[PDB]
Amino acid sequence: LKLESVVIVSRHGVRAPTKATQLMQDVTPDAWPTWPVKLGWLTPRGGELIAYLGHYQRQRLVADGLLAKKGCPQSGQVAIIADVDERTRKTGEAFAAGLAPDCAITVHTQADTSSPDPLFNPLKTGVCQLDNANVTDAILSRAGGSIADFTGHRQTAFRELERVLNFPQSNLCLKREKDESCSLTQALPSELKVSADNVSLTGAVSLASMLTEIFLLQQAQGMPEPGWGRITDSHQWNTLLSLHNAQFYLLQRTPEVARSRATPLLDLIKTALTPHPPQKQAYGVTLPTSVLFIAGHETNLANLGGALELNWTLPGQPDNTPPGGELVFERWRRLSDNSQWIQVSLVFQTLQQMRDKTPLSLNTPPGEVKLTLAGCEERNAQGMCSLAGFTQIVNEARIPACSL
Ligand SMILES: [K+]
């Protein structure tokens, strides 16, 4: 098996909280920690960690004979594509710096940087629209037929998150004027909101998913005592993040939402893995190429795993699609019979690897889970999906109206 091609779909790195609203301040008596960068901006530490990942992959790709040990990679050998958010553009710059330092590798973004990128947001940009009847039904089925059903299984994790927050002493909890229950699910009833370009949950679910991610972010960023020192063992970490992981299982991994949102990415990956005459398609980037790096969001990876049926969990990582988490796709050729095979994987730093700023390397690698396409009918011994089967899964998952 000769390794021929590699498409890495990565999440951005450790970033500042995206939002810092007055609801977040009102659910806890304690002050939220400041960050070194503006909201939603990648932090230097996040870049370095992403850089480590860039360095490990370089080594590993050398080892597989895909890249050259010494000096910068050949022209066109590496391609970086990144969404317009600073965090994603910086994450692309950070990866390059680690994969091949001091080489001038361009990070290719959408020209108008203040517009969404259709390749990362085909719904918010007009390419296609979710169907309300089918998307709501399907989300409600996944919830177990109702949102009440869903949030009923969440009371344990809300109890733990209420504790970490010190919710009873919170400005909101005093709803309780001088007759109303303090309970977090009862103060913020969750509500499924589906439209043509967006599906969301308003209430404790959306906010629990956000604050647990902030906790997790504080951990990877090295900040002293995340959760105000109220998170103390991995059990508590896994119980909190259950809320984040669970709000992505429902919204992002529903296929009637995942197939649509992810079709431009499916079409990009598809075109980067197929042996084909050289082609400068999107972002001025010629495909196919050796290593293609795509810097996106947790939603892009969730959508891909829902549409492709790649279900995974990251031992040592409470966040299922953590900062810098990578869905790696590789085309290997079998020399015996000259056939193309596809292999998928989740590469990642464990939360302790982020909080120790551990330097990755061949001998200090990151977590890595090997995935298999549920639907693939043509596997090798290694459990790789044939290029034909993988192509056929993609064509079945993709939603043509949502292609760029
Ligand atoms: K406001």
Author numbering: 6 to 183, 185 to 410
Authors' text:
AppA, the Escherichia coli periplasmic phytase of clade 2 of the histidine phosphatase (HP2) family, has been well-characterized and successfully engineered for use as an animal feed supplement. The E. Coli periplasmic phytase, AppA, is a 1D-6-phytase (EC 3.1.3.2) and initial hydrolysis preferentially liberates the phosphate at the 1D-6-position on the inositol ring. HP2Ps catalyse the hydrolysis of phytate via an obligatory phosphohistidine intermediate.
The AppA-HET variant, which produces almost equal amounts of InsP5 [4/6-OH] and InsP5 [1/3-OH], shows the greatest reshaping of the active site. The structure reveals the glutamate residue to be found as the t rotamer (χ1 = 168°) pointing away from the substrate analogue, instead forming a salt bridge with H250 and making only weak interactions with the sulfates bound in pockets A and B. Furthermore, there is no low energy (or otherwise) rotamer described for glutamate which can leave its carboxyl group suitably positioned for to directly participate in catalysis. This is consistent with the low turnover number recorded for this variant. The sum of these changes presumably produces an active site able to accommodate multiple binding modes. However, the electron density for the InsS6 molecule bound to the active site of the AppA-HET variant was less well-defined. Given that this variant shows a reduced stereospecificity in hydrolysis of phytate it is possible that the enzyme may be able to bind the substrate analogue in multiple orientations. Consequently, the sulfomonoester groups at positions 1D-3 and 1D-6 of the inositol ring of InsS6 were simultaneously modelled in the primary specificity pocket adjacent to His17 to model static disorder in the binding of the inhibitor.
